[PDB]
Design a protein around this nucleic acid. Structure first.
Ligand SMILES: [Mg+2]
Ligand SMILES: [Mg+2]
Ligand SMILES: [Mg+2]
Ligand SMILES: [Mg+2]
Ligand SMILES: [Mg+2]
Ligand SMILES: [Mg+2]
Ligand SMILES: [Mg+2]
Ligand SMILES: [Mg+2]
Ligand SMILES: [Mg+2]
Ligand SMILES: [Mg+2]
Ligand SMILES: [Mg+2]
Ligand SMILES: [Mg+2]
Ligand SMILES: [Mg+2]
Ligand SMILES: [Mg+2]
Ligand SMILES: [Mg+2]
Ligand SMILES: [Mg+2]
Ligand SMILES: [Mg+2]
Ligand SMILES: [Mg+2]
Ligand SMILES: [Mg+2]
Ligand SMILES: [Mg+2]
Ligand SMILES: [Mg+2]
Ligand SMILES: [Mg+2]
Ligand SMILES: [Mg+2]
Ligand SMILES: [Mg+2]
Ligand SMILES: [Mg+2]
Ligand SMILES: [Mg+2]
Ligand SMILES: [Mg+2]
Ligand SMILES: [Mg+2]
Ligand SMILES: [Mg+2]
Ligand SMILES: [Mg+2]
Ligand SMILES: [Mg+2]
Ligand SMILES: [Mg+2]
Ligand SMILES: [Mg+2]
Ligand SMILES: [Mg+2]
Ligand SMILES: [Mg+2]
Ligand SMILES: [Mg+2]
Ligand SMILES: [Mg+2]
Ligand SMILES: [Mg+2]
Ligand SMILES: [Mg+2]
Ligand SMILES: [Mg+2]
Ligand SMILES: [Mg+2]
Ligand SMILES: [Mg+2]
Ligand SMILES: [Mg+2]
Ligand SMILES: [Mg+2]
Ligand SMILES: [Mg+2]
Ligand SMILES: [Mg+2]
Ligand SMILES: [Mg+2]
Ligand SMILES: [Mg+2]
Ligand SMILES: [Mg+2]
Ligand SMILES: [Mg+2]
Ligand SMILES: [Mg+2]
Ligand SMILES: [Mg+2]
Ligand SMILES: [Mg+2]
Ligand SMILES: [Mg+2]
Ligand SMILES: [Mg+2]
Ligand SMILES: [Mg+2]
Ligand SMILES: [Mg+2]
Ligand SMILES: [Mg+2]
Ligand SMILES: [Mg+2]
Ligand SMILES: [Mg+2]
Ligand SMILES: [Mg+2]
Ligand SMILES: [Mg+2]
Ligand SMILES: [Mg+2]
Ligand SMILES: [Mg+2]
Ligand SMILES: [Mg+2]
Ligand SMILES: [Mg+2]
Ligand SMILES: [Mg+2]
Ligand SMILES: [Mg+2]
Ligand SMILES: [Mg+2]
Ligand SMILES: [Mg+2]
Ligand SMILES: [Mg+2]
Ligand SMILES: [Mg+2]
Ligand SMILES: [Mg+2]
Ligand SMILES: [Mg+2]
Ligand SMILES: [Mg+2]
Ligand SMILES: [Mg+2]
Ligand SMILES: [Mg+2]
Ligand SMILES: [Mg+2]
Ligand SMILES: [Mg+2]
Ligand SMILES: [Mg+2]
Ligand SMILES: [Mg+2]
Ligand SMILES: [Zn+2]
Lengths: 100, 84, 99, 138, 208, 125
RNA sequence: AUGUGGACCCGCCCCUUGGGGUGUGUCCAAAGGGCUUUGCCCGCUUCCGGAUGGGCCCGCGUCCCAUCAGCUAGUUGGUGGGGUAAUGGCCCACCAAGGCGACGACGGGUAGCCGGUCUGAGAGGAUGGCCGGCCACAGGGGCACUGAGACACGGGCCCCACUCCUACGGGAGGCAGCAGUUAGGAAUCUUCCGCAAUGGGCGCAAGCCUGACGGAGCGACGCCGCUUGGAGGAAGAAGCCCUUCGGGGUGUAAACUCCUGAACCCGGGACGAAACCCCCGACGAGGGGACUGACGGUACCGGGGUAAUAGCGCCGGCCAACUCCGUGCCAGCAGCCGCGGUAAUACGGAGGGCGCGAGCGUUACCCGGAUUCACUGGGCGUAAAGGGCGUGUAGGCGGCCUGGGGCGUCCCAUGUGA
């Protein structure tokens, strides 16, 4: 079966393309604590509908482009700029790690 | 073509083939798709030959091709004796 | 001092030119139809595309071009020549096209 | 605040026992409950009674022990020789029905939250489940 | 190859007769009778308390020195035993006893296992009609060990075969004295021979 | 620590430093003698131990110990290095194998001839 | 030229990311050779299937240094093109200004990955050598051609490095194939036999090729099996060790007496081989009949038949095995603790003893012991270890009740797990 994933949009700043942020929970191989992770995907929106916050689903697809192999499936829960902010501050805080 | 042939096993001076299907360009002890019975050419045991005779014809149906010394051990298993 | 199946390469030399020669003709002819289909002359155009079409497949039987390549050629070709003749042109013949 | 209430319960008992008291009061939950219960069903405790204290609900838990021994230190054996949290918020412990304890060779008892609830090693095996191992007791 | 030379030093040293010669180790004088004290210049001197290791050591060798085999062949059997079922230890004796050359000693075809071996090695012994010249053969139930034809006679068999008329051969054993043949019947339980050894310690030793 | 920390770092894996780096995972290493002399060991005792300074393959020049009683080593003498310090003499971390190359075995040694590169003598006649 | 049939543009049809169906228009096929010849066989061309082998893509997993913290111009997306068996920024235009990173980008160091393998109670740790699966390279690089298939070890062009031949008139080569040589190294073999068998290529088939393979050769390198004997044999010689000079030890050991008998000599002698082919039947099903063994006169079988190599380590404690002598902080031992200073069970030899045995030691390395990186399974008052003290970002963690969702988690079934 084609992979099915669920995540938040953080970028609409590409033409007819977007960036979906996927989480996953699971235990640590040795320490068993249940932990999270993240992967960004470049999702295809051939009709730039989806936008910032659109908690959506995407699906493994034939190579639309380099880096870009997921089409959007469907909206699930639009308007979630709260989750988006997490990704934002986290990337912001990166500046205060500049080895100076 | 794909084939059915003698894949050597056992030891030095102690042959013990494994009757098998694979690509004619695989190694003669290389990876195979499915084993169909054994063959000690030294008759050191009652069970010195065995086939899953159904599968044997199945691969033969689709287009397998045994050897000049693999049919002999399948002719000797009524694969060819085709009733009336 | 060596294998005399070096012919296999010398064989390639002929097969090289032979199938190369046909291949130049394919495009130089394919050239024509395109230019013409752009200058309204939809008559002489579809005389070439019809010739184009035959030139390809005729080599496709052999060992030159094969597979969906002829298709990929012919497609994008009449996918284009016709999409040029939209400039009035008038389908002077369906003599290539199932219009 | 209490990061873990379940641990706090167990720990409250363990503290109470080591001074040999009648009862041990502890904040209430429908999940702390069906966790205790077993401790009466397996007779580790006398039992409890849902009561209220200062307008707030608690669970007076009544402690079993053993015989007034003799010799110096006549203090009786405990019923509860040992009890400790396993799955924790710092590290949650889940197990398949196979991967399941043999606490003190049958003499001990694990306690787990499962798709059918607060089973034991013995039960969960027989119902064929396994789940979040809460604690071990003997 | 095997141990060769001074044997009677070993009925002693271990400090316990282990009947390793022919009739001598059975006759009034088995290297111990006269001198039941350890070999060498330091013989008639008072021993110091052994180490636990020392205790375990002596017990192992004893057993091996009894069956008289390489440390090579010996330990394989222990691990084999150590790997197997349940008791996975005491069973050991069963594996030791299944040795062809061992059996032949019990079957009284010879008197020393050393004498037994030279027979098997010279192939004067047969199994189920088969010329078997390998002293390591793990025999099993119902297998039959008999003198071959070229050797049914031989001065060395007759008297060695004869003198067996007296004693009840092992429960796991049987012998057509006239027919020159025997049957391995079963696996000798620990009961079936209280060897002068405490096999518990050999185990303890080998788990170094 | 705590478990969170364990994910953040893990536990560090010790590592193990060699004590025979002049060899490079080799059982031995051939060399050439530069100096051959005697030295005084750690106060603990006292004597005049025979050690050679050896220039080997890998440009290296290390002090190697000469064991037993007497030898046949002037300066330019091919040698073979073993491995194993002396403890008495600081700095020396390597032995010389006897009876190999220009260094020969111990004359009239009857016991531990496995070392000391001494061949078995004739006992009868 | 024929057109079953296929491809391409537009249409509707269903289906749905270029799948299927059809409408019209236009393009596409070829091959003959041999006969128990007038009939069959080996081939030819189109299409759909099947099966096998793949190409591309995706999720998750995969080393050390943060004393590498910022990286990026085809960079990221778009549009349209070029290209391929086909997706794609794979390449090219143009447009947009994006894409990545403390969940460790970028940089540096090491490494072919796995099934496995070694150790370990386990959890782990270590490792990838032979065998098997995949990737990668073929002197160093680049490139394409032919082709179903390669950018091709023993095919081709070019550049470089290197070596060789030559009347020098100029040209030639690519062992990481099999052996073998050199050099390097502590160290790794025969320039052997045969296609008899298995497998592979060609052919209708005989048959041909096969340093794949089947064997042989060299090396205690490893594992395993076996021998240098067995029974007897003294109150127990000689010699050699101690000795309180009475004796004790080596020691049933030898001798010696019987018995067997590794080797070697003679004879015989394989399995591994049954098919391809041949007869009848239709060369199919079938019975049937026939050739071939490199290893090799080898193993094994029979008879005859000879008592026939033993070494190495250790014997202060850990650690099993003790005494004379020599030596006198010397010569020397040593894995740690330490032995040697004129009485050394610790050096050296000797006798004796312990331990393995065609082996015994040593060195180097991996795991164990080490619960000494501690998930299982540890600590931080004085032993090494609480940040000098706040505030707080991300992050981790979260009280009491009832619902929905069932993400984690739990069960069953099934496929996969070679
Ligand atoms: Mg292949
Ligand atoms: Mg046949
Ligand atoms: Mg091509
Ligand atoms: Mg057992
Ligand atoms: Mg000193
Ligand atoms: Mg001093
Ligand atoms: Mg020494
Ligand atoms: Mg035509
Ligand atoms: Mg269609
Ligand atoms: Mg043709
Ligand atoms: Mg002709
Ligand atoms: Mg392929
Ligand atoms: Mg561009
Ligand atoms: Mg484009
Ligand atoms: Mg495109
Ligand atoms: Mg291609
Ligand atoms: Mg990430
Ligand atoms: Mg890091
Ligand atoms: Mg690098
Ligand atoms: Mg490498
Ligand atoms: Mg692994
Ligand atoms: Mg294991
Ligand atoms: Mg194991
Ligand atoms: Mg593991
Ligand atoms: Mg690994
Ligand atoms: Mg290696
Ligand atoms: Mg290799
Ligand atoms: Mg491999
Ligand atoms: Mg080279
Ligand atoms: Mg090639
Ligand atoms: Mg090439
Ligand atoms: Mg390649
Ligand atoms: Mg070559
Ligand atoms: Mg070579
Ligand atoms: Mg050299
Ligand atoms: Mg070589
Ligand atoms: Mg070889
Ligand atoms: Mg062949
Ligand atoms: Mg063949
Ligand atoms: Mg053929
Ligand atoms: Mg012919
Ligand atoms: Mg040839
Ligand atoms: Mg050849
Ligand atoms: Mg070979
Ligand atoms: Mg050998
Ligand atoms: Mg050696
Ligand atoms: Mg005596
Ligand atoms: Mg004497
Ligand atoms: Mg004797
Ligand atoms: Mg005789
Ligand atoms: Mg013969
Ligand atoms: Mg043939
Ligand atoms: Mg037949
Ligand atoms: Mg026949
Ligand atoms: Mg002969
Ligand atoms: Mg004979
Ligand atoms: Mg003799
Ligand atoms: Mg004799
Ligand atoms: Mg030792
Ligand atoms: Mg030891
Ligand atoms: Mg001792
Ligand atoms: Mg004296
Ligand atoms: Mg003196
Ligand atoms: Mg002295
Ligand atoms: Mg003194
Ligand atoms: Mg010592
Ligand atoms: Mg000494
Ligand atoms: Mg001695
Ligand atoms: Mg000695
Ligand atoms: Mg811990
Ligand atoms: Mg500690
Ligand atoms: Mg603390
Ligand atoms: Mg201090
Ligand atoms: Mg401190
Ligand atoms: Mg403080
Ligand atoms: Mg602070
Ligand atoms: Mg500060
Ligand atoms: Mg917070
Ligand atoms: Mg929370
Ligand atoms: Mg909560
Ligand atoms: Mg499964
Ligand atoms: Zn005796």
């Amino acid at each position: 079966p084609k992979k099915v994933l669920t995540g938040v949009v953080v970028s609409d700043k590409m033409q007819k393309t977007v960036t979906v942020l996927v989480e996953r929970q699971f235990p640590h191989p040795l320490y068993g604590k249940v932990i999270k992770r993240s992967k960004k995907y470049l999702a295809h929106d051939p009709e730039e509908k989806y936008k910032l916050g659109d908690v959506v689903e995407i699906i493994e697809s034939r190579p639309i482009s380099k880096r870009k192999r997921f089409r959007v499936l469907r909206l699930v829960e639009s308007g979630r700029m709260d989750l988006v902010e997490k990704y934002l501050i986290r990337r912001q805080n990166y500046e205060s790690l500049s080895k100076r | 073509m794909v084939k059915i042939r003698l894949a050597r096993f056992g030891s030095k001076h102690n042959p013990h083939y494994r009757i098998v299907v694979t690509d004619a360009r695989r190694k003669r002890d290389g990876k195979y798709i499915e084993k169909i019975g054994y063959y000690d050419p030294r008759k050191t045991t009652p069970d010195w030959l065995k086939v899953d005779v159904e599968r044997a014809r199945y691969w033969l149906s689709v287009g397998a091709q045994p050897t000049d010394t693999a049919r002999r051990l399948l002719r000797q298993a009524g694969v060819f004796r085709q009733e009336a | 001092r060596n294998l005399s199946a070096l012919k296999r390469h010398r064989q390639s030399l002929k097969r090289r030119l032979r199938n190369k020669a046909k291949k130049s003709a394919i495009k130089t002819l394919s050239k024509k139809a395109i230019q013409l289909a752009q200058e309204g002359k939809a008559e002489e155009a579809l005389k070439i595309m019809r010739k184009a079409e035959s030139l390809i497949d005729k080599a496709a039987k052999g060992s030159t071009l094969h597979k969906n390549a002829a298709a990929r050629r012919k497609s994008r070709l009449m996918r284009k020549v016709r999409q040029l003749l939209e400039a009035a042109g008038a389908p002077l013949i369906g003599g290539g096209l199932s219009a | 605040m209490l990061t873990d209430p379940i641990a706090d319960m167990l720990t409250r008992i363990r503290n109470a026992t080591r001074v040999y008291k009648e009862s041990t009061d502890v904040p209430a939950s429908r999940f702390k409950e069906e966790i205790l219960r077993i401790l009466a069903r397996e007779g580790f405790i006398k039992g409890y009674e849902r009561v209220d204290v200062d307008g707030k609900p608690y669970l007076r838990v009544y402690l079993k022990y053993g015989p007034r021994r003799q010799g110096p230190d006549p203090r009786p054996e405990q019923v509860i020789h040992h009890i400790r949290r396993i799955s924790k918020p710092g590290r949650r412990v889940y197990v398949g029905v196979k991967e399941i304890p043999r606490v003190r060779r049958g003499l001990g008892i694990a306690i787990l939250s499962t798709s059918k609830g607060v089973l034991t090693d013995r039960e969960a095996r027989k119902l064929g489940v396994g789940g979040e191992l809460i604690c071990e007791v003997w | 190859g095997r141990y060769i030379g001074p044997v009677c030093r070993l009925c002693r040293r271990e400090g316990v007769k282990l009947y390793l010669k022919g009739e001598r180790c059975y006759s009034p004088k088995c290297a111990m009778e006269r001198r039941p004290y350890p070999p060498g210049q330091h013989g008639q001197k008072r021993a110091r308390r052994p180490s636990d290791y020392a205790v375990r050591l002596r017990e192992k060798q004893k057993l091996r020195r009894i069956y008289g085999i390489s440390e090579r062949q010996f330990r394989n059997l222990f691990e084999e035993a150590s790997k197997k079922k349940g008791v996975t230890g005491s069973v050991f004796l069963g594996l030791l006893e299944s040795r062809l050359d061992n059996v032949v000693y019990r079957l009284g075809f010879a008197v020393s296992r050393r004498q037994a071996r030279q027979l098997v090695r010279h192939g004067h012994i047969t199994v189920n009609g088969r010329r078997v010249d390998l002293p390591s053969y793990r025999v099993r139930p119902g297998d039959e060990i008999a003198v071959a034809e070229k050797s049914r006679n031989l001065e060395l068999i007759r008297q060695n075969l004869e003198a067996m008329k007296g004693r009840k051969v092992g429960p796991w054993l049987s012998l057509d004295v006239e027919g020159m043949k025997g049957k391995f019947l079963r696996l000798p339980d620990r009961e079936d021979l209280a060897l002068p050894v405490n096999e518990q310690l050999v185990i303890e030793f080998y788990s170094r | 620590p705590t478990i969170n920390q364990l994910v953040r770092k893990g536990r560090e894996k010790v590592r193990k430093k060699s004590k025979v780096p002049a060899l490079k995972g080799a059982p031995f290493r051939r060399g050439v003698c530069t100096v051959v002399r005697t030295v005084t060991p750690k106060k603990p005792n006292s004597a005049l131990r025979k050690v050679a300074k050896v220039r080997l393959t890998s440009g290296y020049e290390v002090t190697a110990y000469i064991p037993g009683e007497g030898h046949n080593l002037q300066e330019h003498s091919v040698v073979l290095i073993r491995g194993g310090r002396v403890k008495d003499l600081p700095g020396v971390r390597y032995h010389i194998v006897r009876g190999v190359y220009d260094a020969a075995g111990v004359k009239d040694r009857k016991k531990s001839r496995s070392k000391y590169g001494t061949k078995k003598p004739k006992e009868a006649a």
